[model samples]
Target: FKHVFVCVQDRPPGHPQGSCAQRGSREVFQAFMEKIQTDPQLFMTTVITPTGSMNACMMGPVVVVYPDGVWYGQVKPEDVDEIVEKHLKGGEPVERLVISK
Candidate 1:
């Protein structure tokens, strides 16, 4: 696979800080999964994995892309297209949303 998109680590409901699910990670994950997985250009090339705490629970809705090691924090469903278009297709990682590299 060219990319492994790891969603925020989902925790059980009622965690002290909060869960990724509660922070809308699932929505982001679903958006990425459907958007990238079903695309003709990205078919069989990208995988969105729902992980539980990428060691950044504080950044609950974190999204990390591997093979490139780009970490994006506070991601929402609204940001999926930019990531797909600019980063995945255009070969440019969106700096405005990135938290790490």
Candidate 2:
């Protein structure tokens, strides 16, 4: 139950609905995996998992941190570090990256 889900939806090259995979969610997901694996503090608690279409496809590269249920959108590979440090380690969600419903 303690996991981060990174949407890696794929919908071809030019689908109207678009897709997270098309916008580089795979890399974002990989970044999460790498960050969690390297940081022993986080490694013991969190597990990053690849997901498909979180129903927020417009916001490609979306990551949801739970059980807090915080959703971050348009995530870049570089942001993964800050997220792990600030949120996972420091216990404060990255406000700027958070997507409000």
Candidate 3:
């Protein structure tokens, strides 16, 4: 409990709106799990889950954090550590990656 990461939704590449998976969501999802599980503090406090789309595929690999109610877009595998170090530990969302609604 402290952080829940929700990211995923696979759609066929044929779709007009595309899908999170079309943009590498699977890799991003794996990244979150691997990154957090390997970290001692995050392993204990964080939960990563694969979820359906918000229908917002404007960016690939969107990641959502809650019950903090934060949305992040274009989260590559490399950025998971920063999320772990900054948001999870620093207690602040990464400003640059955020997707404002």
Score residue 53 of candidate 2 by CA lDDT: 88
User: Between prediction 1 and prediction 2, which has the larger lDDT?
Assistant: 2
Task: Report, for all candidates in order, the number of backbone clashes.
Answer: 3, 0, 0
- Candidate 2 residue lDDT tens string, 10-63: 998678869888888899888888887877778899988888788887876788
Looking at candidate 1, the ten consecutive residues that score lowest on lDDT are 1-10
Model 1, residue 39: C-alpha shift (Å): 1.2
Off by over 4 Å in 1: 12-14
Top TM-score hit? 2
Candidate order (TM-score): 2, 3, 1
Question: lDDT by residue for model 3 over 1-101, one digit each (tens)?
Answer: 66555557877767887887777788888988887777887888888888888766877678888778888888877887787788877888889899952
Q: Rate the local accuracy (lDDT) of all candidates.
A: 0.78, 0.84, 0.79
Descending-lDDT candidate ranking: 2, 3, 1
What is the Cα-based TM-score of model 1? Answer: 0.86
lDDT of 3: 0.79
TM-score of every prediction relative to native: 0.86, 0.91, 0.88
